[PDB]
Amino acid sequence: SELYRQSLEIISRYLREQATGTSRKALETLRRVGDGVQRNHETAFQGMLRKLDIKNEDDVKSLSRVMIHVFVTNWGRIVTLISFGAFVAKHLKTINQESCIEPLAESITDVLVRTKRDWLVKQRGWDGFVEFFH
């Protein structure tokens, strides 16, 4: 969909620049909130990641199964999911699995647009995300 194209664009772009170091407003919004959410969820994300063996793309595809199962809907919970993505992306970089980063972004985008599409249409998509954190 039109939303999916921007979604994967935004989520992939954000997970990339995080791994290294409307769509324009969503990205800036994501830059603002994401690092704050990772910092406070540091011990949370660590604990969750520690109980999830991710040494390959098999585990990345298996991570989306529990991500799409574990999924109240608000931009807070959405930015937390994408933020957890950035945290796993950084991890994948430290263990020489950089090639699993674009697929991780796709898995997260898949889960977001699948389970909560009704809500995003209702929200005016990423224009709404920018408003929630405005």
Binding site: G36, V72, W75, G76, R77, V79, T80, F132, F133
Partner: protein, 88 residues
């Protein structure tokens, strides 16, 4: 006062990261909250006057901290952002 003391400390931490400075947070001397148009927003603007030490000298600063609350997965979560930080 608990959320207020953590917001002042965060303001000093956030200021001196954004402006490459080394302020030591001492205390909140005065706290004002400008709460959002409607409570459904759950966004609070905190105005804080705080004491911090600069070059081992006690100075005072006005900090405006925006806080957007939302219902996280098992916990109340928020995004804090330093909007302004200047001496007074």
């Amino acid at each position: 006062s608990l959320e207020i003391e953590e917001l002042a400390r965060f303001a000093v931490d956030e200021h001196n990261k954004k402006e490459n400075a080394l302020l030591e947070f001492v205390r909140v001397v005065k706290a004002k909250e400008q709460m959002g148009v409607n409570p459904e927003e759950m966004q609070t603007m905190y105005y804080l006057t705080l004491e911090a030490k600069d070059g081992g000298k006690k100075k005072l600063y006005e900090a405006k901290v925006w806080v957007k609350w939302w219902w996280g997965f098992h916990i109340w979560d928020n995004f804090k952002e330093l909007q302004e930080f200047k001496p007074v």
